[PDB]
Amino acid sequence: MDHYLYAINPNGKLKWKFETGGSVHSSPAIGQDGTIYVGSNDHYLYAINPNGKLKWKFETGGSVHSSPAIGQDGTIYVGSN
Amino acid sequence: MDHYLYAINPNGKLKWKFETGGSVHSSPAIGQDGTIYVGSNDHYLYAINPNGKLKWKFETGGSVHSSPAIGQDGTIYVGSN
Amino acid sequence: MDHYLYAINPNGKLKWKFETGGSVHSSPAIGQDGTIYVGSNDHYLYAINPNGKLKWKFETGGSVHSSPAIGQDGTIYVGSN
Amino acid sequence: MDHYLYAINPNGKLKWKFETGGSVHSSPAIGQDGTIYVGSNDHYLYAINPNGKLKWKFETGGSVHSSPAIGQDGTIYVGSN
Known part of the structure; x- marks a missing residue:
């Protein structure tokens, strides 16, 4: 599989994807400085x-x-399985 | 099973439904111009x-x-399986 | 099972629960007038x-x-399975 | 599997972890005084x-x-299975 976090532009095009070690079911959050936080199946x-x-x-x-x-x-607050 | 993204008025009457390819587990998000985004199990x-x-x-x-x-x-940021 | 949407007070006590016909996996949303929207396994x-x-x-x-x-x-925007 | 709700600093170093009874599928929410809420599979x-x-x-x-x-x-509003 891909395991990526996607960053897509308003026009439909790709900005970047980032690879984790497992699947990304968490939804992203965005802090004041523009940092993006998200969890993965990979721990x-x-x-x-x-x-x-x-x-x-x-x-x-x-x-x-x-x-x-x-x-x-x-x-940043998040739980684990 | 259904697979749509539903737009429903505050009065409860349907506004529109947009058929996607599979179940929509993804919760939508609303951008500045009002565009609605949402994942789909159709990838x-x-x-x-x-x-x-x-x-x-x-x-x-x-x-x-x-x-x-x-x-x-x-x-727009989002993760994939 | 219970199938309820819960409304709990800052002090830990119950305000009300509401019954649907199936399980509540959706997360609630709150509109300007205080209305609470949430989905259920019951459609x-x-x-x-x-x-x-x-x-x-x-x-x-x-x-x-x-x-x-x-x-x-x-x-109100929400998808279906 | 883990079961905690994690508090982690913007620098990445752990702040605290609070052990709950089961996996935390629930995403937390932050109230006015800073209290963090979150469901748990321990019901x-x-x-x-x-x-x-x-x-x-x-x-x-x-x-x-x-x-x-x-x-x-x-x-605080939330749904149960």
């Missing part, structure tokens, strides 16, 4: 930069179907 | 006008479960 | 009043795991 | 402080897949 929560490069990957105990929330001070 | 991220006409669809490698998010500049 | 999208009584129920072709969006003019 | 809608301490949990009849929504007045 991690991923921080991707607006241009599509990894920022960091945090590792939890299981797959991530829960979708992140961002609180005022920038904390 | 596409769809984008609909406020009048039920297809604007465009973007082909992903797999089923799109993830619900899209929209950045400040209109970029 | 319908449900409009519930702030006090917990039905407002109307719209019927689609399949179960509703997609979660609704509300656009500016009050349209 | 509860949880509510966490910004410091990883349980505020309260509310027992539903079944697994809570739905992600909560919050009204103007702080009421």
Whole structure:
């Protein structure tokens, strides 16, 4: 499979996709600085930069179907399976 | 099973329905000009006008479960299976 | 099973629950007038009043795991399975 | 499998994790005082402080897949299986 997070332009064209190690069921969230957070079936929560490069990957105990929330001070909240 | 994205008035009467290729697990998102986006299990991220006409669809490698998010500049982000 | 939509108070106590005909996997959305919209495994999208009584129920072709969006003019958008 | 709700800093380092009873499919939501809410497959809608301490949990009849929504007045809405 593909396992990618997609970033698509208003005109229908691709901007970038980013690869995780498993399927992306989480829905993306976007913090004040433009960072995109999303979970994967591969265990991690991923921080991707607006241009599509990894920022960091945090590792939890299981797959991530829960979708992140961002609180005022920038904390990212998400559950794990 | 149904497979549509439904537009329904606050009064409860249907406004329009747009048939996609498979079940819509994806929750829609609304951009600045009012375009509605939503994944489809037919592997596409769809984008609909406020009048039920297809604007465009973007082909992903797999089923799109993830619900899209929209950045400040209109970029549409979403994950695929 | 229960099939209910729950409305819980900041203090942990119950305000009301509402019964559908099947399981509630959709996540709720809230329109400007306080109306709560959510889907069910039983096929319908449900409009519930702030006090917990039905407002109307719209019927689609399949179960509703997609979660609704509300656009500016009050349209409710949701997919079906 | 993991079962936690994770709080992670914008820098990527863990802030706290709060163990719930089962997998967290539910996506969290953030209220006015900063309380984080989230369902759990252990049949509860949880509510966490910004410091990883349980505020309260509310027992539903079944697994809570739905992600909560919050009204103007702080009421927490959510659906159950």
